[PDB]
Design a protein around this ligand. Structure first.
Ligand SMILES: Nc1nc2c(ncn2[C@@H]2O[C@H](COP(=O)(O)OP(=O)(O)O)[C@@H](O)[C@H]2O)c(=O)[nH]1
Ligand SMILES: [Ca+2]
Ligand SMILES: [Ca+2]
Ligand SMILES: [Ca+2]
Ligand SMILES: [Ca+2]
Ligand SMILES: [Ca+2]
Ligand SMILES: [Ca+2]
Ligand SMILES: [Ca+2]
Ligand SMILES: [Ca+2]
Ligand SMILES: [Ca+2]
Length: 903
DNA sequence: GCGGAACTACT
DNA sequence: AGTAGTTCCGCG
């Protein structure tokens, strides 16, 4: 079909691009690309080229890129603007693919790899690569195979080959539980020497050069390690062969006692999945280990193996290798579920950029606006720098800490991109300034109307209402494109059902899969043929209908992610269209809006319930307001409600038929007041929360800004079977807290909201004793010792020493003169427990090796002096009180039943 | 490292 | 205790 690119690169004066041919073959190309730039000219030399300001420009075509750059520097001294796209890779993509790109991921080579490197001393530093690579599994998507390169005769031991027959059996037999559907997709290659092994790994890499490279943290470890290693042994010029163009660029970094290398390989796109998972996940994981995330996303357990990690190879090789493969596999399962690489390509090919530039909102948007502008003979402004300096932020109401029974919230749609469209804020729409009053004067409609000819903002800017802005025109385009892909998706997910129903009655015969476009609901003619098709054809059509559905879905998650990252570009000094005054016009507007709708709602609810000065808005998000329906319920006794599911119904209607309308009216009166281009502030109710009918629960509470808990029944229309707990900033998932205390802290919240003060106390008492009876290692902690030697002063903790190092020294002191005891080594991993004051160890804590169990040398004292109380009060009662105090409760009664017996 | 949450440590 | 100063994630 139409060809698409794989990678674009600027190597001096030529562009090096890898692409897919019109006949589907992968091809490479070199092009001494000849760029163009622009310069302003007089109103008599004008042609067809204009900047966003309307002033004419003349084109300048250079012989090569070096000249073009050279001409920009030169143009700088003269003091004249150099308009035009200065990143020549994007201009070349815009010229070579002047049409919507339609790609076929099935022709794109995506590589996923992980390596293993045995280390006696500390964690192997990549920038040094002193330790040999004894394993390396490479999964190629084109071939759908797991290529395992297993070493066999290292300076750290020699071993037996891996056995696939074993690998698939139950561990309870010696097997490694390697998934079934993976066993036949493995190609095991055993080697007798590293240098050998390594060379083969390169022939492999040239014969199957990745286009996209993934793994779990391959960017800050695996890649630099493989690079430096090969370098060390064969030379940087036979290491640069990991680059299809023999060009690399090594960047170095280091802070105090940490240092790293990130080797950018020319001609190949690196999308580290961890880096990727942290961006599109939108879920803060308290940890990002392959192990933790794999559990979260796959409810799969941390593969077991005993002994210290640094010797798992000479100890047990079989399992050593099997856990290398499993891990590469766990990463595919996460992608097969999150589909993040697939989202990368889509967004990448949409903006026409290098796929990795997806991590940068600046590049992506810069390309979109450029391409949009170029198709109109428009010339982009030259990027000039400006001093970084903050401006007002998001208004966040300081809530009065307390309990809140009935609460329903309202959110306004895509607030910021929406302001940019309402006020018409863009760099070339600025039209003036006005004498500005205090912000309070504006939220209260006390100040004078700024203008009757221009669109304004509370900060003092005015914009042109007669012309569309470059930025706002672009936002609207992307917004309308989502609606388009929604439809395609729904129609494909709909044509999908039709096809399945057909499959219930396959026609015994031989036919073909119909030639139809799945983005559109099938015609009656098609539907009628479906019923007669065979099972082969039909099953095919289901694939293709299913393919089309996912495609339209990713397309819209894309336009959605895009729109949300725009404000991030417009506020960044390095964005080509940045302007401090505009960035501030958006932020000051958003503030005013929120506090204006606040006054209005407080106005409308006090009138409707017949009262005065009452405050119904208890808290304000940056784009949300939380209202307490307390009186709105008291207005109806709360004894006239059948079940709880009844009042949820009632409030649901009271917000749609009365709340919403009074809100829309208010946002329009503000649109005129500020005289804006188009009214776009849409604030719809989203959540309904409170305590189960006829219960003692409190409903919810706020401790402070961004810290609250709500018992939610309905969210934007969908009624929950079981109420859901919404927890924000109460830190109930600290990595520092024992898993059992995380579950207990969440339990006290549910009981406070759904059951009540009484029910709370009962439970605090319960967890109290059950916690004091937990195994030690249960409540222990982990961290590693990677700078103990320094912190060590004559055997004791030196100044500013870290807790775990204190333990690693305390342990270190009780083991002097013993050889059976597991020693702690620089870089290893350890366990830490707080010791009770007065212990035989002489310090407040102690640590020990995580790879083996506590020496019988100290075990008994450790168990006897473990400081349960300090942990219990530090991780469970200190935070618990924050909730209770603010909510006006007590997790323990001071006076109980016994003080009736006059003992 | 990055960027930074997220932990000590001090006037 | 706010405000200021450190560790350090993820990788064997
Ligand atoms: N319009 C436009 N072109 C740019 C800018 N920067 C570099 N160019 C280059 O301008 C040329 C585009 O002109 P083109 O559309 O082919 O002109 P025409 O087709 O002869 O009218 C290409 O070499 C672009 O890469 C820019 O900011 N705006
Ligand atoms: Ca790894
Ligand atoms: Ca590993
Ligand atoms: Ca990284
Ligand atoms: Ca049939
Ligand atoms: Ca919100
Ligand atoms: Ca208006
Ligand atoms: Ca909504
Ligand atoms: Ca101190
Ligand atoms: Ca220091």
């Amino acid at each position: 079909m139409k060809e698409f690119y794989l990678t674009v690169e600027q190597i001096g004066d030529s562009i090096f691009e890898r692409y897919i041919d019109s006949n589907g073959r992968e091809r490479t190309r070199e092009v001494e690309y000849k760029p163009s730039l622009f310069a302003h000219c007089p109103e008599s030399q004008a042609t067809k080229y204009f900047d966003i300001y309307g002033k004419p420009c003349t084109r300048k075509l250079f012989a090569n890129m070096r000249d073009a750059s050279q001409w920009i520097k030169r143009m700088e001294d003269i003091g004249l603007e150099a308009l035009g796209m200065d990143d020549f890779k994007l201009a070349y993509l815009s010229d070579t693919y002047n049409y919507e790109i339609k790609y076929d991921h099935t022709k794109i080579r995506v590589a996923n790899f992980d390596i293993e490197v045995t280390s006696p001393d500390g964690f192997p530093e990549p920038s040094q690569a002193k330790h040999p690579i004894d394993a390396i599994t490479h999964y190629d998507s084109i071939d759908d195979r797991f290529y395992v390169f297993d070493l066999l005769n290292s300076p750290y031991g020699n071993v037996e080959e891996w056995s696939i027959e074993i690998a698939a059996k139950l561990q309870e037999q010696g097997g490694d539980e390697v998934p079934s559907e993976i066993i036949d997709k493995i190609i095991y290659m055993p080697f007798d020497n590293e240098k050998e092994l390594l060379m083969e790994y390169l022939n492999f890499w040239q014969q199957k050069t990745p286009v996209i490279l993934t793994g779990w943290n391959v960017e800050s470890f695996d890649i630099p390690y493989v690079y430096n290693r090969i370098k060390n042994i064969f030379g940087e010029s036979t290491a640069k062969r990991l680059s299809p163009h023999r060009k690399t660029r090594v960047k170095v970094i280091e802070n105090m006692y940490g240092s790293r290398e990130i080797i950018t390989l020319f001609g190949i796109s690196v999308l580290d999945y961890i880096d990727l998972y942290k961006k599109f996940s939108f879920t803060n994981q308290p940890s990002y280990s392959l192990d933790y995330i794999s559990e979260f996303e796959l409810n799969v357990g941390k593969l077991k193996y005993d002994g210290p990690i640094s010797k798992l190879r000479e100890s047990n090789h079989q399992r050593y290798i099997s856990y290398n493969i499993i891990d590469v596999y766990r990463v595919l399962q996460i992608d097969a579920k999150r589909q993040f690489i697939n989202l990368s390509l889509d967004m990448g090919y949409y903006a026409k950029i290098q796929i990795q530039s997806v991590f940068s909102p600046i590049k992506t948007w810069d390309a979109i606006i450029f391409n949009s502008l170029k198709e109109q003979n428009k010339v982009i402004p030259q990027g000039r720098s400006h001093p970084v300096q903050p401006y007002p932020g998001a208004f966040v109401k300081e809530p009065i800490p307390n309990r809140y029974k009935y609460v329903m919230s309202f959110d306004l749609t895509s607030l910021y991109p929406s302001i940019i469209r309402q006020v018409n804020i863009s760099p070339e729409t600025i039209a003036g300034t006005f004498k500005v009053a205090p912000l309070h004067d504006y939220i209260n409609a006390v100040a004078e109307r700024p203008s009757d000819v221009y669109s304004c903002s509370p900060n003092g800017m005015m914009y042109y209402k007669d012309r569309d802005g470059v930025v706002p025109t672009e936002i609207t385009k992307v917004f309308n494109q989502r609606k388009e892909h929604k439809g395609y998706m729904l129609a494909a997910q709909r044509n999908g059902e039709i096809i399945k129903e057909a499959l219930h009655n396959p026609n015994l015969s031989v036919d073909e899969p119909l030639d139809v476009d799945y983005r559109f609901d099938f015609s009656d003619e098609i539907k009628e043929k479906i019923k007669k098709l065979s099972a082969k054809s039909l099953n095919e059509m289901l694939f293709r209908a299913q393919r089309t559905e996912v495609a339209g879905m990713t397309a819209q998650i894309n336009r959605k992610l895009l729109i949300n990252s725009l404000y991030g570009a417009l506020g960044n000094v390095w964005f080509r269209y940045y302007d401090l005054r505009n960035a501030t016009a958006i932020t000051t507007f958003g503030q005013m809006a929120l506090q204006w709708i606040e006054r209005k709602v407080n106005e409308y609810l006090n009138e409707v319930c017949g009262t005065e000065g009452e405050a119904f808005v208890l808290y304000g998000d940056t784009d949300s307001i939380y209202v307490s329906a307390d009186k709105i319920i008291d207005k109806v006794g709360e004894s006239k409600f059948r079940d709880t599911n009844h009042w949820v119904d009632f409030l649901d209607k009271f917000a749609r038929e009365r709340m919403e309308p009074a809100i829309d009216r208010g946002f329009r009166e503000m649109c005129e007041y500020m005289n804006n281009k188009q009214h776009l502030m849409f604030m719809d109710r989203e959540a309904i929360a409170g305590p189960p009918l006829g219960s003692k629960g409190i409903g919810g509470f706020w401790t402070g800004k961004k810290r609250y808990a709500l018992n939610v029944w309905d969210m934007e229309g969908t009624r929950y079977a079981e109420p859901k707990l919404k927890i924000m900033g109460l830190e109930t998932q600290k990595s520092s807290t024992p898993k059992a205390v995380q579950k207990a802290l969440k339990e006290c919240i549910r009981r406070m909201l759904q059951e009540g003060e009484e029910s709370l106390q009962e439970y605090f008492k319960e967890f109290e004793k059950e916690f004091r009876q937990l195994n030690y290692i249960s409540i222990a902690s982990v961290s590693s010792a990677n700078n103990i030697a320094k912190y060590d002063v004559g055997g004791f903790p030196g100044p500013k020493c870290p807790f775990h190092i204190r333990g690693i020294l305390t342990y270190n002191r009780a083991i002097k003169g013993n050889i059976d005891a597991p020693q702690v080594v620089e870089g290893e991993k350890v366990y830490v427990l707080p010791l009770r004051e007065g212990n035989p160890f002489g310090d407040k804590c102690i640590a020990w090796p995580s790879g083996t169990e506590i020496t019988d040398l100290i075990k008994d004292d450790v168990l006897h002096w473990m400081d349960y109380t300090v942990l219990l009060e530090k991780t469970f009662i200190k935070p618990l009180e924050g909730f209770t105090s603010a909510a006006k409760l007590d997790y323990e009664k001071k006076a109980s039943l016994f003080d009736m017996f006059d003992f």
